[PDB]
Design a protein around this ligand. Structure first.
Ligand SMILES: CN(C)c1cc(-c2ccncc2)c(-c2ccc3ccccc3c2)nn1
Ligand SMILES: Fc1ccc(-c2n[nH]cc2-c2ccncc2)cc1
Ligand SMILES: Fc1ccc(-c2n[nH]cc2-c2ccncc2)cc1
Ligand SMILES: [Zn+2]
Length: 336
């Protein structure tokens, strides 16, 4: 076991191995807090996340396990992964805190688009990277579900990573989720990418809904109200009544709406912002789109190893989730 040292930062206690020095608070979330630090062992700047109340309930405990299982599995350039995971606990009985370590990332996509507007080359590179990461995640039968600019880490070099997804959101959400459809698919994430891309090209939020109903309205005004084929798939009586009760609207001409943008980007946007999710382009297909000809390489867009999500259907005791999480901490093998 390594030697740990203790300190308090922004009301939070950090108990970390001596190898991590110069801890500096980067921010706090509802699920944990993060410090930037220097990893003396590798010479790298890292971000250290201390999970908040990881075993407070069955929900937290299961979430903590999910987070650790997912992060231990993600090994891809465009997906946040683990350099280290540790706990100051010396045994399972005293196990109460979990710390996660990854490469320090300087900013998020929201910071970038917010000041100022991006060149077409940057939009190509940034979206390409999202999609490359998404291909990988999707290949593991995982759906991100909450992709948005604040969840995309980007460094000075324009390198991008999808964050732990894992642990207003509304604006980037697929319309079928606004309708509370219980059987949405992986293309909910493609919808989000389309919204992000649009924003990077125009400098404006595409669908700034004030609530779920307004969100749906803004979406239908751009893409049109659903046609017959899509209406047939809506099992909910009330949702169908509502939708069909709306003044019918035509799909707008994307070339006109995003005029000035690279026509290839407009073409791709149209393939991503398809109302019927069964007809939306997938991440793998999007990577092959001509818009990314300068970046696409089918021999360098890997898929993920199989990911066992069976635990998701289990109803276990807090101590069981805790012990499973503890095993995962102890079995972690750092990357080379
Ligand atoms: C912006 N946001 C919601 C973030 C931003 C970060 C972050 C900030 C700076 N560099 C890297 C990440 C982490 C975060 C921070 C540390 C992490 C450590 C291990 C695994 C995942 C981690 C995720 N989690 N969420
Ligand atoms: F005014 C109304 C009328 C009907 C609905 C409704 N019934 N089922 C689903 C919905 C609905 C409508 C808009 N956005 C999400 C869900 C919501 C508001
Ligand atoms: F108004 C809309 C907006 C989106 C959808 C939609 N797109 N893909 C799947 C659906 C959908 C929504 C509700 N129930 C089944 C399927 C359907 C109607
Ligand atoms: Zn909670």
């Amino acid at each position: 076991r390594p030697t740990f040292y203790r300190q308090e930062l922004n009301k939070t206690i950090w108990e970390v191995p001596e190898r991590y020095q110069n801890l500096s608070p980067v921010g706090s979330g509802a699920y944990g807090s993060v410090c930037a630090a220097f990893d003396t062992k590798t010479g790298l700047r890292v971000a250290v996340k201390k999970l908040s109340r990881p075993f407070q309930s069955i929900i937290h405990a299961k979430r903590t396990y999910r987070e650790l299982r997912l992060l231990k599995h993600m090994k891809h350039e465009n997906v946040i992964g683990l350099l280290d995971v540790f706990t100051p606990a010396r045994s399972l009985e005293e196990f109460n805190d979990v710390y996660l370590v990854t490469h320090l990332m300087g900013a998020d996509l929201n910071n970038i688009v917010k000041c100022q507007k991006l060149t077409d080359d940057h939009v190509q590179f940034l979206i390409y990277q999202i999609l490359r990461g998404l291909k990988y995640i999707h290949s593991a039968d995982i759906i991100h579900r909450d992709l948005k600019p604040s969840n995309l880490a980007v460094n000075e070099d324009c390198e991008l990573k999808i964050l732990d997804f894992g642990l207003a959101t509304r604006w980037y959400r697929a319309p079928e989720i606004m309708l509370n459809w219980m059987h949405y698919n992986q293309t909910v994430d493609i919808w989000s990418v389309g919204c992000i891309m649009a924003e990077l090209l125009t400098g404006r939020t595409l669908f700034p809904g004030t609530d779920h109903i307004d969100q749906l309205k803004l979406i239908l005004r751009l893409v049109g109200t659903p046609g017959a084929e899509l209406l047939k798939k809506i099992s909910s009586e009330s949702a169908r009544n509502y939708i069909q009760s709306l003044t019918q609207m035509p799909k707008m001409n994307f070339a006109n709406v995003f005029i000035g943008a690279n026509p290839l980007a407009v073409d791709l946007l149209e393939k991503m912002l398809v109302l019927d999710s069964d007809k939306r382009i997938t991440a793998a297909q999007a990577l092959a789109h001509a818009y990314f000809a300068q970046y696409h390489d089918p021999d360098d867009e890997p898929v993920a190893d199989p990911y066992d999500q069976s635990f998701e259907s289990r109803d276990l005791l807090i101590d069981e989730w805790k012990s499973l999480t503890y095993d995962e901490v102890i079995s972690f093998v750092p990357p080379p």
